[PDB]
Amino acid sequence: KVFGRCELAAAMKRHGLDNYRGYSLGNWVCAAKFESNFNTQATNRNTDGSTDYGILQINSRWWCNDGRTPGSRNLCNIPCSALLSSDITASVNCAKKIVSDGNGMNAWVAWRNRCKGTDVQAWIRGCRL
Ligand SMILES: [Cl-]
Numbered sequence: 001k002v003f004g005r006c007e008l009a010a011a012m013k014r015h016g017l018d019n020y021r022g023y024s025l026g027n028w029v030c031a032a033k034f035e036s037n038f039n040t041q042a043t044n045r046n047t048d049g050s051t052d053y054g055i056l057q058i059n060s061r062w063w064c065n066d067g068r069t070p071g072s073r074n075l076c077n078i079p080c081s082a083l084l085s086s087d088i089t090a091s092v093n094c095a096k097k098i099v100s101d102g103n104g105m106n107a108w109v110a111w112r113n114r115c116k117g118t119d120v121q122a123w124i125r126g127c128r129l
Pocket residue numbers: 021022103104105
């Protein structure tokens with residue numbers, strides 16, 4: 001599923017992301033835009049052999065099991081394919097674990113490089129929330 005900007009904002013808000021660990025909704029929408037272009041089916045392979053999955057590009061090195069990343073952990077306790085669903089519940093629940101691990105949203109490279117320190121409220125402007 002390819003989300004619309006406001007459709008995703010509303011989905012994330014419903015799932016408890018707004019101001020989660022101090023990160024306003026705009027941060028999450030901005031991260032999703034630049035990680036996956038709002039596409040739940042996005043995958044990208046990393047140099048180390050791990051793969052990033054879904055709307056928030058969650059890494060199989062630490063967070064999910066894809067059966068092909070030797071010596072990796074499965075901290076969210078889910079198959080990586082679950083992160084590709086049109087239902088974002090699994091991705092959000094896992095993101096909550098990631099953002100709580102001490103490094104905040106810096107875990108997401110595109111958030112650090114393209115959202116951090118910008119006017120992120122612009123990403124939810126106009127939306128009915
Ligand atoms: Cl933080």
